[PDB]
Design a binder for these strands. Structure first.
Ligand SMILES: NC(=O)c1ccc[n+]([C@@H]2O[C@H](COP(=O)([O-])OP(=O)(O)OC[C@H]3O[C@@H](n4cnc5c(N)ncnc54)[C@H](O)[C@@H]3O)[C@@H](O)[C@H]2O)c1
Ligand SMILES: [K+]
Ligand SMILES: [K+]
Ligand SMILES: [Mg+2]
Ligand SMILES: [Mg+2]
Ligand SMILES: [Mg+2]
Lengths: 56, 56, 52, 33, 123, 48, 105, 255, 309, 20
RNA sequence: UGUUUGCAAUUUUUUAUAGUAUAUAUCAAAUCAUCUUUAUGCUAUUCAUGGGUACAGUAUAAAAAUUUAAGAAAUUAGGUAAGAUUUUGUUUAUAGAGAAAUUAGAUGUAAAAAAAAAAUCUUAUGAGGGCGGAUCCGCUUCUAAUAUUUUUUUGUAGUUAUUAUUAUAAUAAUAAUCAUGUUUAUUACUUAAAAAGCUUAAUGGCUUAAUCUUGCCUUACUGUUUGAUUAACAACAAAUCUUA
């Protein structure tokens, strides 16, 4: 008699992630925060934007 | 087959050493046929050969 | 004619001082593209199209 | 709950009837034992 | 210790006995969920068949051009199929700098940024 | 010395018993066995 | 259909996922806790902000399916509620900021 | 509010709620999911008319035209005919009421859809146990070289349904049994019922012989008939009784 | 048409959309209140069995799809932006970048038998056991070309944390279990040590870590947080080593403890974990690719910078 | 149990009415 | 009023009715601890501790809860049922991490569908075949089934798209195609040898279970008894397997 395990998942919310460029997308996360304002990200890192001179 | 893997006849008959590629590709079996002229393994589609073994 | 496919990360097209006799340029969608280009010229380049 | 009361009564009666039958037969088994 | 108890209280809630029980739907609700389930799976089929159809058409276009390109000759005094043999080379395709990081890193976003496109980019 | 031989006495008070071995550092034995005197499965318990 | 389906599944997630422990994210008697509690009271106890008003437990948990036209399941309503939550409602001293002196995001 | 309307919940829920079809319930997701399937069934029915008119063209086409002759023309119509059957089942397999009608036993078995679900129900469990009874009880190869059942057969003695391979009493099995057979294939066919006892002991030759306990033939059966009483095989229903029902018996001592 | 006649005439999928008037009188909240009673329960009271005894048991378990089933997981809640981005635009490119044209009538390739047999004139060769894998002891999987039918994609991600010191301080494993809970959104499964080393004080068969595996959309969303929010914030980060790869299409790397707290889910409650109890994790990205170069190419298509190890 | 609280809560309301 | 609140949906049984054996309803049990106050409080507002007011599908003030991880630990070894089927080593890669710590990997194929002709045996409790002595035995023709042939072939579509011709359709070729199904797909076959595991050395065996995991159990039962170990140990006895 193989047991049927039941999934143990925590509460999840729908969060808006506003990157440093102002663009906003929706995500599914567990944190309670509503809007995550990201000041630093791939859009403001030189390694991901080598041609950008403002960050250089 | 007994506890120590000893093979015993279950019926009166004649011992027959054979191989059954339909049952297991790489096993060798020992059987007992009621008619000495029979040959094992019996075709899977042939009716079972059995003896009454009772007295009225 | 063999048409390659290119991706533009940034910038805008400039026809100034162009070697080839080019006059105007415009960025069109897949729907507006068929209206501007010829039928035969469009029928050959429509297989490269994508969903959006 | 006008017509449902009528149906619930049929439900209660059936349950009450069996509850009476179960007690009317459990008493019989306690006599044979 | 007090902080650890806060952690344990989180796991104690996820215990199999504490989590909610399996759903219990009636017939009408169950049938309604069946339609929602049935439609969603069919909707994926349409997206799948549509996504796979475009992928097939693009491959056919490449094969047509490539097969045709293989038969052509030139330019000038070049043996037939030279261009076909050169196009099939994969120099640097699997290297570190194969695909530019900038192009790949940029992704789709629900809403645009402050500056949707930068036309001032200079070589 | 590590293992002892215990006697599982029937609880039907028929005087039949079963003898099994078990370690000393364990709990007493208790089983549901067949009493041949009454010819029924009854509860057998360790003697002591 | 995609919008209605997501909202449908998001509400089903309420009935099968563990409850949200505010103690795991906000320390008691702080600006964040008090601010979360006030807005939590405006949502009628629902820790989520895009599923409307629904209680997974109780005698009225079975009514989890919205009627046709429900603006709640629209994306514009989700963004509106989620942005109406990112604004701080309690100053660093624990006093509720007046509704007129609240800075919109 | 009588028993002819269903169960107590229905009779109760049918007097406190509003009169409205189930398909017309004003629910967002349910009405948004019924609109996707709506235009799909219209697309499947639009495909049955494109494949139907495509057979006429192939039907009214000289076999000489086809590079393969008349043999390549019947294999192309065979794949088309089969492709239509799948489209007829895919046009109602998502209907919410068709599932309700079949589960309530009020589904018409003369339509391919209901016979497709009725066969998917039998195979889920009932086929599995009877497929096991055939092997474990050595019905094959004893009686038949190989046998894969294709229709359901449930026999009941005096109302009580007996499970497959169950030792019954000599008094219970004294009257002809009633067969609850459901056929999942189209058309009406004649079915022959043969009850054979394969363990009759023959002490003279020290072996077992087979004795037929019942034989009937020419029994018309359609996918809409369910019950067949082996008592009235020639009185009520059409059929030819070769041998009437013989009470099963087993002498003492024999297995 | 006779074919159309065989269809169900009482079609519910062809019914008209509900009206507005009937929509206004449909109030599930008013119906229950007015009744002031409990509706009789239905006789259908089948519930999924807690244990599956087997396929022929009288009581069977329903498929996991069924909502009543105890394995049911709510369906998708949103479309991961990275899964959408890759399929819509990136997919067409990878197919174009890596493509080898097959002639129209090329004969299909017959895969050779990797377990060779002995063929020859020696009477001994007949019954000789099949030869061992030539080269490595285990056979490596053969690479599949990137075609319109085979586009490498991300399938699942396994985050594994090893905490040797936990054995002595049991509070290191409790905090480790919580970090992977908020980071991934699943219930980690504790792991046990397998080797005994006296120098490192490692004891075998004792809980010394936990792990998680996220599949489907949850995996894509995890990559989004990693590539665009966590990895860019690491100080003096060079990239994923160019040597990563098991030779079958799976990429693996390790994060330091100070970069695990950069996760958006961990930093918000960074004060709820005791000091210096945040562990490091090993992230193994499993993809549909069939080779190391195809996998690295896929990650490069998602914006993953690689550095020469 | 639940109905018990109903009777006790209702009973408490009658005592409160007299007070008011 | 157990079982989800919008309606004959699992199996068997009980009872009742119509009915002449069926049909529906009903009852009980199994499968499952889903949480149930119809508001009595809260909220806002208003009016003098208090009295109202709110009219609810974009549901509502009209109930978001009313009186310290064992699925993190234990190496538990027998009966039975089900499920799983290379677990060892090696190798590849992987923050701390090193010769030595954890984790993830490491074969390939198939899934619309065949029909038909003869031949070679072998089998058959098939034709109760025929002929000698229904079933036994020796001869035997015919049919059937399995196996085999490289044999004799025929067909290899449909669907989606591309290309070509033809007047959106038709025809031909080319590519893809297990998929009405929660892609973490699934199901079947295949994946050398050694090794791991199976109370303990070695040998053999098991992977299609004798291993592992889980559920319920304690036949690790009582009396007598069968045939064997080419008549256990080249006697006897104590032993080993086995049947009723
Ligand atoms: N799963 C099937 O039934 C099926 C059938 C035939 C072929 N395939 C093949 O399997 C591979 C993957 O199957 P797929 O095409 O169904 O992938 P898929 O993207 O449709 O499904 C994968 C996961 O993403 C989710 N998902 C799909 N669409 C979504 C959306 N619009 N919004 C949010 N979440 C969404 C699904 O629930 C699923 O968990 C493909 O190569 C396909 O050709 C799958
Ligand atoms: K056991
Ligand atoms: K092996
Ligand atoms: Mg064992
Ligand atoms: Mg290993
Ligand atoms: Mg001797």
């Amino acid at each position: 008699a193989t047991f049927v395990p039941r999934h143990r998942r925590p509460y999840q919310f729908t969060q808006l992630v506003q990157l440093s460029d102002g663009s906003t997308f929706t995500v599914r996360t567990t944190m309670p925060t509503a809007l995550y304002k990201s000041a630093k990200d791939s859009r403001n890192h030189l390694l991901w934007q080598p041609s950008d001179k403002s960050l250089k | 087959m007994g506890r120590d893997h000893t093979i015993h006849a279950a019926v009166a008959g004649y011992v027959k050493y054979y191989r059954d590629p339909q049952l297991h590709p790489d096993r060798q079996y020992i059987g007992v046929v009621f008619n000495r002229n029979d040959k094992l393994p019996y075709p899977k589609d042939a009716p079972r050969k059995r003896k009454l073994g009772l007295v009225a | 004619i063999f048409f390659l496919k290119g991706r533009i990360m940034a910038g805008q097209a400039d026809l100034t001082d162009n070697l080839h006799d080019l006059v105007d340029f415009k960025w069109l969608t897949q729907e507006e593209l068929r209206s501007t280009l010829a039928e035969e010229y469009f029928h050959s380049v429509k297989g490269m199209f994508a969903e959006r | 709950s006008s017509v449902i009361a009528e149906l619930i009564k049929e439900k209660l009666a059936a349950r009450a009837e069996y509850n009476a039958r179960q007690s009317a037969l459990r008493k019989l088994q306690q006599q044979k034992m | 210790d007090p902080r650890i108890i806060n952690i344990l209280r989180h796991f104690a809630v996820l215990s199999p006995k504490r989590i909610p029980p399996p759903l219990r739907f009636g017939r009408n609700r169950y049938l309604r969920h069946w339609t929602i389930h049935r439609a969603w799976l069919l909707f994926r089929r349409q997206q799948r068949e549509q996504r796979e159809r475009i992928l097939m058409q693009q491959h056919q276009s490449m094969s047509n051009a490539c097969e045709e390109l293989r038969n052509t000759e030139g330019p000038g005094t070049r043996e037939t199929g030279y261009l076909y043999r050169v196009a099939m080379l994969k120099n640097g395709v699997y290297g570190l700098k194969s695909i530019p990081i900038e192009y790949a890193s940029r992704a789709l976003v629900e809403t645009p940024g402050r500056q949707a496109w930068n036309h001032e980019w200079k070589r | 010395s590590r293992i002892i031989n215990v006697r599982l006495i029937s609880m039907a008070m028929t005087g039949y018993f079963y003898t099994f071995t078990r370690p000393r550092t364990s709990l007493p034995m208790s089983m549901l066995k067949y009493d041949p005197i009454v010819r029924r499965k009854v509860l057998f318990l360790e003697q002591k | 259909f995609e919008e209605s389906f997501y909202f449908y599944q998001k509400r089903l997630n309420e009935r099968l996922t563990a409850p949200f422990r505010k103690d795991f994210y906000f320390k008691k008697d702080t600006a964040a806790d008090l601010d979360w509690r006030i807005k939590l009271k405006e949502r009628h106890g629902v820790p989520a902000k895009d599923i409307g008003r629904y209680n997974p437990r109780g005698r009225m948990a079975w009514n989890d399916e919205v009627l046709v036209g429900s603006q709640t399941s629209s994306r514009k309503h989700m963004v509106e509620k989620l942005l109406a939550d990112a604004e701080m409602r309690v100053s660093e001293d624990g006093e509720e900021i007046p509704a007129e002196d609240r800075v919109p995001v | 509010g009588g028993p002819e309307l269903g169960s107590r919940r229905r009779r109760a829920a049918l007097a406190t709620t509003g009169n409205l079809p189930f398909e017309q319930l004003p629910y967002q997701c349910f009405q948004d999911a019924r609109k996707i399937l709506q235009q799909d069934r219209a697309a499947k029915i639009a495909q049955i008319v494109k494949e139907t008119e495509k057979i006429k063209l192939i039907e009214a086409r000289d076999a000489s035209e086809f590079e393969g002759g008349e043999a390549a023309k019947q294999t192309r119509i065979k794949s088309l005919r089969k492709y239509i059957e799948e489209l007829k089942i895919l046009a109602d397999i998502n209907d919410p009421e068709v599932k309700r009608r079949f589960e309530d036993g009020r589904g018409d078995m003369t339509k391919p859809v209901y016979r497709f679900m009725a066969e998917r129900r039998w195979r889920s469990m009932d086929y599995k146990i009877i497929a096991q009874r055939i092997s474990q009880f050595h019905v094959v190869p004893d009686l038949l070289p190989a046998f894969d059942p294709t229709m359901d057969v449930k026999l009941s003695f005096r109302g009580y349904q007996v499970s497959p391979g169950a030792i019954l009493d000599s008094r219970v099995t004294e009257v002809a049994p009633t067969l609850r057979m459901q056929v999942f294939d189209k058309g009406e066919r004649l079915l022959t019922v043969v009850v054979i006892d394969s363990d009759v002991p023959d002490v003279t030759h020290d072996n077992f012989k087979r004795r037929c306990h019942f034989l009937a033939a020419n029994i018309p059966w359609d996918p809409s008939k369910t019950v067949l009483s082996l008592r009235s095989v020639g009185d009520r229903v059409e059929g030819d009784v070769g041998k009437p029902w013989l009470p099963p018996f087993a002498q003492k001592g024999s297995p | 048409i006779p074919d159309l006649a065989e269809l169900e005439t009482r079609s519910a999928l062809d019914a008209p959309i509900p009206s507005e008037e009937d929509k206004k009188e449909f109030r599930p909240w008013k119906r229950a209140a007015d009744r002031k009673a409990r509706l009789p329960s239905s006789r259908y009271q089948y519930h999924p069995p807690k244990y599956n005894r087997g396929p022929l048991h009288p009581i069977q378990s329903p498929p996991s799809s069924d909502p009543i089933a105890r394995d049911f997981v709510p369906g998708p809640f949103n479309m991961p932006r990275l899964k959408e981005t890759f399929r819509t635009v990136m997919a067409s490119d990878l197919m174009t970048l890596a493509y080898i044209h097959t002639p129209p009538g090329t004969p299909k390739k017959e895969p050779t038998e990797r377990l060779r047999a002995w063929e020859g004139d020696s009477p001994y060769f007949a019954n000789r056991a099949r030869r061992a894998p030539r080269g490595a002891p285990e056979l490596p999987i053969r690479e599949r070309d990137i075609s319109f039918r085979n586009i490498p994609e991300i399938k699942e991600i396994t985050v594994s944390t090893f905490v040797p010191l936990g054995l002595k301080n049991p509070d290191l494993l409790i905090v480790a279990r919580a970090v992977l809970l908020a980071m991934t959104g699943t219930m980690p499964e504790m792991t046990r040590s397998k080797n005994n080393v006296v120098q490192w004080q490692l004891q075998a068969n004792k809980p010394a870590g936990c792990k998680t595996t996220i599949y489907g959309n949850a995996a894509w969303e995890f990559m989004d947080r990693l590539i665009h929010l966590v990895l860019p914030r690491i100080k003096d980060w060079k990239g994923v080593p160019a040597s990563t790869g098991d030779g079958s299409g799976n990429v693996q790397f390790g994060l330091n403890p100070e970069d695990v707290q950069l996760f958006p889910e961990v930093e918000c409650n960074y004060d709820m974990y005791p000091a210096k109890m945040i562990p490091g994790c090993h992230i193994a990205i499993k993809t549909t690719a069939t080779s190391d170069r195809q996998a690295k190419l896929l990650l490069q298509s998602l914006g993953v910078p690689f550095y020469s190890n | 149990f639940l109905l018990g609280i109903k009777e006790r809560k209702l009973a408490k309301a009658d005592r409160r009415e007299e007070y008011r």
